[PDB]
Amino acid sequence: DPFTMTPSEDFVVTDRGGIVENSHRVHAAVVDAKGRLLYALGNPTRMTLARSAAKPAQALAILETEGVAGYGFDDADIALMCASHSSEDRHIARTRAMLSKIKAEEADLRCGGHPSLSEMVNRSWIKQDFIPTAVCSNASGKHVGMLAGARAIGAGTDGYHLPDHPMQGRVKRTVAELCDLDAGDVEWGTDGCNLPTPAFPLDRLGRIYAKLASAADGSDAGEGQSTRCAALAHIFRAMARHPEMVAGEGRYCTMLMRAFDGALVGKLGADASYAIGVRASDATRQLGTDGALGISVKIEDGNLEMLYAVVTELLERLGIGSPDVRSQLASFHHPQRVNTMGVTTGGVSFPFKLRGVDDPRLAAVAR
Amino acid sequence: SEDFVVTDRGGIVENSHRVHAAVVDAKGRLLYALGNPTRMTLARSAAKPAQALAILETEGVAGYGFDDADIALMCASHSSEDRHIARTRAMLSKIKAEEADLRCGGHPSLSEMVNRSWIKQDFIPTAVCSNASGKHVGMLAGARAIGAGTDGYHLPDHPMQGRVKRTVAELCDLDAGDVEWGTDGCNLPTPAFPLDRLGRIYAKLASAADGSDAGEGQSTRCAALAHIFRAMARHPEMVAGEGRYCTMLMRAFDGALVGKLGADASYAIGVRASDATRQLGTDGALGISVKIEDGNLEMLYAVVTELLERLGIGSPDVRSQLASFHHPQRVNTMGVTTGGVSFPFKLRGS
Ligand SMILES: [Cl-]
């Protein structure tokens, strides 16, 4: 029944010859630069672990730490602080160059190695029995930034990754401030990279990225800015100008940001969250706002392949970009469903309904 | 009906996965359920024992001399270990066939350890490495056995697939039109039917083994089902491989049950009559089928193991061999425990 559809029915679905294979629940929030909710899928206020989608907020805490500007981190360095990188040799090299700028060493890192987020990098590692170490962590840039912050204020580097350290105190305050939430409304776990990681309603993730894009807009216009807005503009610029540092070759975040050529930034969170900050454009205006836009997505069951398909479909439905811009992501949008003999056996479809002509008696129960 | 398995990071919900499950008696009557026990579901590799039945029921196939390990391979989603490839080639030799006659393709190994070995050695898997290579060799065997020709053995209009289609519905006790069909990863037709009927197949496998073991006047079909159960339980390493859930499950239970994975996170178990099954209020064998709605295998194995615990199937000791699947490790790159898995669902009885 098309006239009683509900958020509980917002799915991305795979089929095999028309027969349902898997289905995945979708949550999404589209917010303006003050966080007002414009469009939604599923439960746009789902309490959600941001994971690496929080990294631009953590980078802001680092950049607002007094004395860090003296280290001479450049834009590509800041993009690495914002990264879940593929552990390509260029990311490892930049991590070592950042350690040298702050006079630290790999032994000071409290993140650990892991299989590369790139299958092609990981294939090279397997061929040489290479065991990844702390410096190959996808989060290595954030960790060097955190060491830099710790050294800059005289706190000392041991323990920089623990909640009681002033660097983590700065992070926690900064996250809650960008979300416009009280401390008690942000929850904290421990991340795979061994730092505190926040959880907050999904729409507030979109709000953070709308603030990133809004600051970029104010910077490009030559508006006076607070030190925080200037730094947010710097983070947006770094990510958009060095998207290979934020992920790597063949990675969704890198291909998405290169396709849009400065119009937006986007960032993955583990277990299938995504956030995009969209600069003010004709597209955003047609969606009903005068400023920048934020988009946040969570696939309830954590499937990454579905996340990238859904994010790309959502950009298409919001009219963000052109068909030629978004066609660079066609392989993510409609993932291949081909068997071991080259036969196409199925595909992906998007039975969700953006909400933002319905009878007023149709309840939209966030689910 | 709102039955989930949930992972958390420090008590904070990370992911949740919808679970469907059917526990049936030997005649398929529903005894316990999670979610939607009649969910229309692609059985994928969990259908392979029924495809093995079609092969073994083909006239002339017994003349090839397949043994219980070969039949176990027909029923398998093997890890493509060297020993699976070797048995595949041995089975081709028994029917005087060539790897070039197989119509399945190579794929990255279902064992990441095997796959890593392949990567290190620049190995490109071919048809004989397919996890379903035993099924395809059996299909070639049945095609040759009735003189139908190996050409096109995997196509729906070939009599071997006609036999498979008919056998799947007969075992489900469904009319042909109630089973839907697509194309599998291994390039054969693959069936979809309500989830509880997958449990029904496996209860019939275990029931047949109980009847064989009991000296009961069986048809040739029940005798073949009994043989299929015996081959899987005696050679579980062929059905999956070292470290695989199916192999470890069947080894732990030492003949009391067979279990089989289906791609995109289905699972089927046939349980022979036991103190545990009588405790569940049935005087015969039992079948269990499970589907994780979003396709996550890690959650599948954890749920199945929890389900065996809730049903009292096995002893705590026997199930503890599966502890690493039951509560998956949730540790970060520095050895800190960051989370865990919870099972807020409740079995509903009849
Ligand atoms: Cl260094």
Numbering used by the authors:
A (entry chain B): -3 to 352, 357 to 367
B (entry chain A): 4 to 353
Paper text:
The crystal structure of this mutant revealed that the absence of Cys135 caused small structural rearrangements in the active site area, almost identical in the two subunits of the dimer, and triggered a collapse of the metal coordination site, since the mutant protein was unable to bind the Zn2+ cation. This disability was additionally confirmed by ITC affinity studies. The hydration pattern of Ser48 is nearly identical as in the WT protein, with three tightly bound water molecules in the close vicinity of the Ser48 hydroxyl group. These water molecules form strong hydrogen bonds with the Ser48 Oγ atom, with O…O distances in the range of 2.4–2.7 Å. In the close vicinity of these waters and Asp187, we observed a bound polyethylene glycol chain in subunit A or a glycerol molecule in subunit B, both located at the exit of the putative active site. The side chain of Ser48 is H-bonded to the Nζ atom of Lys51 and the Oγ atom of Ser80. The pattern of H-bonds at the two lysine residues from the Ser-Lys tandems, Lys51 and Lys263, is roughly the same as in the WT protein. Only one conformer of Asp187 is visible in the electron density maps, with one of its Oδ atoms forming an H-bond to the Nε atom of Arg47. Interestingly, the side chain of Cys249 does not carry its typical chemical modification, which may be linked to the absence of the Zn2+ cation in the protein structure. The structures of the C135A and C189A mutants demonstrate that alanine substitution of the cysteine residues involved in zinc coordination led to collapse of the metal binding site and abrogation of the L-asparaginase activity.
